[PDB]
């Protein structure tokens, strides 16, 4: 339906991240016009402006967002939530604006066990970096060429959980999954199938 702005534009002007105060502006929102920032302020709180930590059950507000014109930068996630199911229905990240003019998707130092981006089908421009996630799996299975829209888009899956570590806990793609990878263990988490 209607669209909303990103962090630093519109209702989130002069704001650095998505905190427990501006998340209310994402209600009934289907498209983000810019970049959103999920910084460690969102869950450790803010002592200056007295912002309490954003509730992990409140991240389901972003389930209605399926389009991001800018870049998606995540540097903090609740220790309770084991995936990014807040963006479960996110489908496209255009990456017109990029973090440092390079990255359109960044997942840095989270305890999540999976990405859970079941609906993501296109990343138009920008590199994808996923660093410091000790529990993350299903990352090296994803065929990122299917999502990229510009030649030269790179994928940096670095400093993450080992290949055998995920294979030891049976956290791999389902047997029905296509060789292109998956966002989780469930049969619905596949990017394609036959």
């Amino acid at each position, epitope marked *: 339906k209607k669209v909303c702005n990103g962090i630093g534009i519109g209702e989130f002007k002069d704001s650095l991240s998505i905190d427990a105060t501006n998340i209310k502006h994402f209600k009934n929102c289907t498209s983000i016009s810019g970049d959103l920032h999920i910084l460690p302020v969102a869950f*450790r709180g803010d002592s200056f402006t007295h912002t309490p930590p954003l509730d992990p059950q409140e991240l389901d507000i972003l389930k209605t967002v399926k389009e991001i014109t800018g870049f998606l930068l995540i540097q903090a996630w609740p220790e309770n939530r084991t995936d990014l199911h807040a963006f479960e229905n996110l489908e496209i990240i255009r990456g017109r604006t990029k973090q440092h003019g390079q990255f359109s998707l960044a997942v840095v*130092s989270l305890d999540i066990t999976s990405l859970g981006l079941r609906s993501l089908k296109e990343i138009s421009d920008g590199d994808v970096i996923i660093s410091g996630n000790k529990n993350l799996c299903y990352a090296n299975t994803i065929n990122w060429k299917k999502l990229f829209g510009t030649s030269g888009q790179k994928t940096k899956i670095i400093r*993450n959980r*080992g*290949e055998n570590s995920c294979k030891a806990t049976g956290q791999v793609c389902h047997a029905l999954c296509s060789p292109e990878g998956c966002w989780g263990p469930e049969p619905r988490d596949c990017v394609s199938h036959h």
Partner: antibody
Amino acid sequence: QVQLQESGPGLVKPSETLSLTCTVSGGSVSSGDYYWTWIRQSPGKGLEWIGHIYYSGNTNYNPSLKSRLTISIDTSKTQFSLKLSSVTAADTAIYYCVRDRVTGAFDIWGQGTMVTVSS
Amino acid sequence: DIQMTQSPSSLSASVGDRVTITCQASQDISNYLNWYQQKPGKAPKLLIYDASNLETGVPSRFSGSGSGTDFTFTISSLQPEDIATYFCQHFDHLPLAFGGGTKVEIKR
């Protein structure tokens, strides 16, 4: 630009705790672009990655030292520290504090401090 | 864990010679590899990042190549100040690890 420097005792008695502090000058430690990392070098072990800490509080430790390892940040004084307990002669090494950019490189190192474990 | 094996362990060459050293990973690590130079009594210095990119400020005679498992570090014209031990380091997945190092000395 940005410089790192180590500080701490050069002699630690066995089974005790090794404590080191890195002071970051010319910049702040509260940036999402860098992993504040500890690295040690010794004969028999070579260059060894000890671990790092992100400004969100998240830490990653080498499983060879995990059980005795603790890395913390003090953004107030722009510092991050290293704590290694139950040390033996196998922990005698040169310890560097390193800026590990998330892009993937140890691009800024400290001069390095010698730590000897001996009674 | 990923094992990084460098070859050779040490070498000596004349000034101006072309020097090539190898880093071999036990697994496919894409281009998640960096090259470091450690001169006597100094901390290691970053020269090559992402296997092939020259760090700003590093002389142009240093270069790196490779992806997957086999990588090569090259000095096009060996100079006397290049006496050092050269390390390769991966950042594919946890934990990070260095190679054993290659000692480079000058023949005069």
